[PDB]
Write a protein that binds this DNA or RNA. Structure first.
Ligand SMILES: [K+]
Ligand SMILES: [K+]
Ligand SMILES: [K+]
Ligand SMILES: [K+]
Ligand SMILES: [K+]
Ligand SMILES: [K+]
Ligand SMILES: [Mg+2]
Ligand SMILES: [Mg+2]
Ligand SMILES: [Mg+2]
Ligand SMILES: [Mg+2]
Ligand SMILES: [Mg+2]
Ligand SMILES: [Mg+2]
Ligand SMILES: [Mg+2]
Ligand SMILES: [Mg+2]
Ligand SMILES: [Mg+2]
Ligand SMILES: [Mg+2]
Ligand SMILES: [Mg+2]
Ligand SMILES: [Mg+2]
Ligand SMILES: [Mg+2]
Ligand SMILES: [Mg+2]
Ligand SMILES: [Mg+2]
Ligand SMILES: [Mg+2]
Ligand SMILES: [Mg+2]
Ligand SMILES: [Mg+2]
Ligand SMILES: [Mg+2]
Ligand SMILES: [Mg+2]
Ligand SMILES: [Mg+2]
Ligand SMILES: [Mg+2]
Ligand SMILES: [Mg+2]
Ligand SMILES: [Mg+2]
Ligand SMILES: [Mg+2]
Ligand SMILES: [Mg+2]
Ligand SMILES: [Mg+2]
Ligand SMILES: [Mg+2]
Ligand SMILES: [Mg+2]
Ligand SMILES: [Mg+2]
Ligand SMILES: [Mg+2]
Ligand SMILES: [Zn+2]
Lengths: 127, 98, 60, 118, 155, 80, 24
RNA sequence: CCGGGCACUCUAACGGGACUGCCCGCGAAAGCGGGAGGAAGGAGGGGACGACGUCUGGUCAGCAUGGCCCUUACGGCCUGGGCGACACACGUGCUACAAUGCCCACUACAAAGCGAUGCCACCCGGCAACGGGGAGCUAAUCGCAAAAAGGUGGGCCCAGUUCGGAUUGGGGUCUGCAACCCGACCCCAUGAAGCCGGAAUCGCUAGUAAUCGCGGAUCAGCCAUGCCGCGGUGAAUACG
């Protein structure tokens, strides 16, 4: 009937709803390529489907908020994989070596005092 | 429909003194929708460690205001019995509207 | 903090602009946080003694 | 063609070409092409003699341009100096007149850097 | 890397040709962290590789990269009071790095007005064995073996 | 490219002084510590000693000097 | 660039508004 | 947006979870190499945290304090000037020198913060700064607010230019008793040096460098390009 996943990347969340159908994807009411497209990376979001050979089997309704559009792409990429897992658990063993179900823990590193940004040190002369 | 806003510097004190209001209003009153967390207001102060020069020292402090919700449905007059004044908490401040 | 300069507090500064804040504790002119009314040094000292309610060491 | 004094802009957009007029920047060019109803996109070589005549008509006397402009500025500075103003002094010894630090920088006003011993 | 052996970063495959080498090239083209504009440049370049050459831009690319790879380079060494230029082999990784880098640099040295054209033309010329990149390669391989006498300083 | 606002500022110390002179005459000089005061037409022809922080400088004022502050005619710093 | 008072980016950098960077 | 509902997102309290626990190999052991499962492994990432002591390090000018010294002035009030001087020299930075770019128009995604003599939606006047009017907000409920780079469309066509905005002339707005010395901001005109920088020299090993914007503290205003934070996009390389 319907299958759900979340996923997150770089402080961006996406609700991913897989509803069996034609394969047309919706994000925030817009077409998939309305939101993306002008972004080369975009297609990567749908990589889980292409991995399990889903594609035109499931349709998708996706809510997306947080981060920038690339992080949103990765979060979507997770959510699709999670919902896909909830559908058929036997997908996990196929999906895992690609690591699509792996959350990416990389986050903007805090700025530290005395530095310029978080690492970069103020330059000096000494003479 | 009684609006309550609980603010304080101690999350322990707030969270604990809210459930007192809730439990007091449960017996004498409605389902008591219960505390909704609300975001915290964090105020930072960054200050140089030393009295002289040494601009690279810092060590900032933070002062944070936690919030709580309550908001009991069915403002029964029987409820204000266990309610009104019975409380432990000191550094909690309470706001109330209709 | 020279003692005559603690004439800072004046109901009659003669102009609103001539009114400047100082540290209520040590009498420091520069680096005076408006929230605490203190200066930065006193701020750190008292914060370390635990005399400023809610003020904690921040890390993240 | 020849507009507002001895200067002839050529072979590029009329606005950008009008920029080469002394007292005329991008704003006044935009405005002049606006009130004269000329498409700013056309090349100067594509301007109708009618259009050029109209442009000249407007621009020539609406704002003070070129030589008269320069003369006016020179007369302003000369005035500043003659009255004994402070700005007059800063103009006199060639230092920043707008109240900027002369300790370092202030090079463009002071010109090339003349080094001595230390 | 004083302690470890410093393992190599694996790159995500290309979104089009599914090749990691492509991605690497994309990254070398990248400037101020704009990947999108980079991909724009390279793919436009690929579409320029056709209707010039009838072949597949992938093949042209890979073969150019293969032609730019130096087999020998010269590294300096301090020996007994002087500094000698010592010839020696180039590990495959460094071959790839130098190849891609040189391709991009030579590309931006070109006269052509816009990026994609520059990358395309450089890619082609290098693929058939001419152009700035190959000039670099041959210059380096010439430096080494001109220094042949120092080959026993190898290390 | 300067500015002040509508309601131009002139210190009322000498403002009444100069017209007090104008009523009965010209007299001689003046001594003013306020250099922040704008120049107005009624001042023309007079002479104003302006404090440069050290001494009072005898600034004679003309028709073309109107609108500038007195301090512009009394430079504070001594250079070379 | 970011130093041109009369440009959009100039306004953004300088943090102000005006003729070249409207408030809508 | 209304009814309606805590499933999801989020918010903020408690709690679970990872310990070389399991498999193979090496080892006397501690442990090392690899693999499985897992969101995460071998210190998962980043903070707070800096030993006995060293530099007769810095600060009596934040405060405290021994000694010494001035007490019609080495104390005190005020107006004005100065800390903003400019032949020069250095440090840290900002903006650039352009087409992987600049400009105009339209359009999309964030986090952390601040807000009552405050933030100021919306309407009108003004090219604009801004002015007049005025709703909401003790603020997850209103405002600052526009995020920018990005995407789409169009202009520029390699030139000191539609690059770059210093300098200077003129006209204004705001704060403030008061912008000459010595404020910021708007508009018109001006349109400098600069074509990637000698010897020398600096930072950074991953969401880092690079790049793009956003907020705050102090403060009437502001010389903030500084500092302290926030997120967007997101590399190269490490033989040794
Ligand atoms: K010059
Ligand atoms: K040696
Ligand atoms: K840790
Ligand atoms: K000592
Ligand atoms: K450079
Ligand atoms: K830039
Ligand atoms: Mg960042
Ligand atoms: Mg330290
Ligand atoms: Mg004292
Ligand atoms: Mg003040
Ligand atoms: Mg103060
Ligand atoms: Mg001109
Ligand atoms: Mg000066
Ligand atoms: Mg070793
Ligand atoms: Mg080269
Ligand atoms: Mg006025
Ligand atoms: Mg410009
Ligand atoms: Mg629930
Ligand atoms: Mg420890
Ligand atoms: Mg100073
Ligand atoms: Mg001198
Ligand atoms: Mg001399
Ligand atoms: Mg120095
Ligand atoms: Mg709005
Ligand atoms: Mg309007
Ligand atoms: Mg709401
Ligand atoms: Mg475009
Ligand atoms: Mg275009
Ligand atoms: Mg120009
Ligand atoms: Mg030149
Ligand atoms: Mg050029
Ligand atoms: Mg030189
Ligand atoms: Mg060098
Ligand atoms: Mg390191
Ligand atoms: Mg401020
Ligand atoms: Mg200044
Ligand atoms: Mg700022
Ligand atoms: Zn103090």
């Amino acid at each position: 009937e319907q299958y759900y996943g979340t996923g997150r990347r770089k402080e961006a969340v996406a609700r991913v709803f897989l509803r069996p159908g034609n394969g047309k994807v919706t994000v925030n009411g817009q077409d998939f390529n309305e939101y993306f497209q002008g972004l080369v990376r975009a297609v990567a979001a749908l990589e889980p489907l292409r991995a399990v050979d889903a594609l035109g089997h499931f349709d998708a309704y996706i809510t997306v908020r947080g981060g920038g559009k690339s992080g949103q792409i990765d979060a979507i990429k997770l959510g699709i994989a999670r919902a896909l897992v909830q559908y058929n658990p036997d997908y996990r063993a196929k999906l895992k070596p690609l690591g699509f179900l792996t959350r990416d823990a990389r986050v903007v590193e805090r700025k530290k005092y005395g530095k310029h940004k978080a690492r970069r040190a103020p330059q000096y002369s000494k003479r | 429909k009684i609006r309550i806003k609980l603010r304080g510097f101690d999350h322990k004190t707030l969270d604990a003194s809210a459930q007192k209001i809730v439990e007091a209003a449960r017996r004498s009153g409605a389902q008591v929708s219960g505390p909704i967390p609300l975001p915290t207001r964090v105020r930072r102060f960054t200050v140089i460690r030393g009295p002289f020069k040494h601009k690279d020292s810092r060590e900032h402090f933070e002062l944070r205001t936690h919030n709580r919700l309550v908001d009991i449905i069915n403002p029964n007059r029987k409820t204000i019995e266990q309610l009104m004044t019975l409380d432990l908490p000191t550094g909690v401040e309470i706001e109330i509207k209709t | 903090a020279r003692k005559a300069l603690i004439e800072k507090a004046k109901r009659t500064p003669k102009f609103k602009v001539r009114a400047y804040t100082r540290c209520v504790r040590c009498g420091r002119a520069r680096s005076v946080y408006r929230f605490f009314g203190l200066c930065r040094i006193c701020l750190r000292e008292l914060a370390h003694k635990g005399q400023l309610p809610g003020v904690r060491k921040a890390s993240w | 063609a020849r507009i507002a004094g001895v200067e002839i802009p050529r072979n590029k957009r009329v606005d950008v070409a009008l920029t080469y007029i002394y007292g005329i920047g991008k704003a006044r060019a935009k405005e002049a092409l606006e009130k004269t109803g000329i498409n700013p996109a056309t090349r100067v070589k594509d301007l109708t003699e009618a259009e050029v005549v109209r442009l000249r008509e407007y621009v020539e006397n609406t704002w003070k341009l070129e030589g008269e402009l320069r003369a006016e500025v020179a007369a302003n500075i000369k005035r500043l100096m003659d009255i004994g103003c402070y700005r007059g002094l800063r103009h006199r010894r060639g230092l920043p007149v707008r109240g900027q630090r002369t300790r370092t920088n202030a090079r463009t006003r002071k010109g090339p850097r003349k080094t001595v011993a230390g | 890397a004083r302690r470890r052996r410093a393992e190599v970063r694996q790159l995500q495959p290309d979104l089009v040709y599914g090749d990691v080498l492509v991605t690497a090239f994309i990254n070398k083209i990248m400037r101020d962290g704009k990947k999108n504009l980079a991909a724009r440049i390279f793919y436009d370049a690929c579409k320029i590789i056709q209707e010039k050459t009838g072949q597949e831009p992938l093949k042209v690319f890979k073969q150019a990269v293969e032609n730019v790879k130096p087999r020998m380079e010269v590294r300096s060494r301090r020996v007994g009071g002087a500094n000698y230029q010592v010839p020696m082999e180039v590990s495959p990784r460094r071959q790839q790095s130098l190849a891609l880098r040189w391709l991009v640099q030579a590309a931006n040295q070109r006269p052509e007005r816009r990026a994609a054209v520059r990358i395309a033309h450089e890619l082609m010329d290098a693929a058939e064995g001419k152009g700035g990149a190959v000039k670099k390669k041959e210059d380096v391989e010439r430096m080494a073996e001109a220094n042949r006498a120092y080959a026993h300083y190898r290390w | 490219p300067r500015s002040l606002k509508k309601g131009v500022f002139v210190d009322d110390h000498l403002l009444e002084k100069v017209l007090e002179l104008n009523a009965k005459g010209e007299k001689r000089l003046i001594k003013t510590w306020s250099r922040r005061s704008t120049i107005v037409p009624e001042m023309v022809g007079h002479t104003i000693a302006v404090y440069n922080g050290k001494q009072h400088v005898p600034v004679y004022i003309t028709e073309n000097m109107v609108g500038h502050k007195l301090g512009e005619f009394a430079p504070t710093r001594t250079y070379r | 660039g970011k130093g041109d008072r009369r440009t959009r980016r100039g306004k953004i950098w300088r943090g102000t508004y005006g003729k070249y960077r409207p408030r809508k």
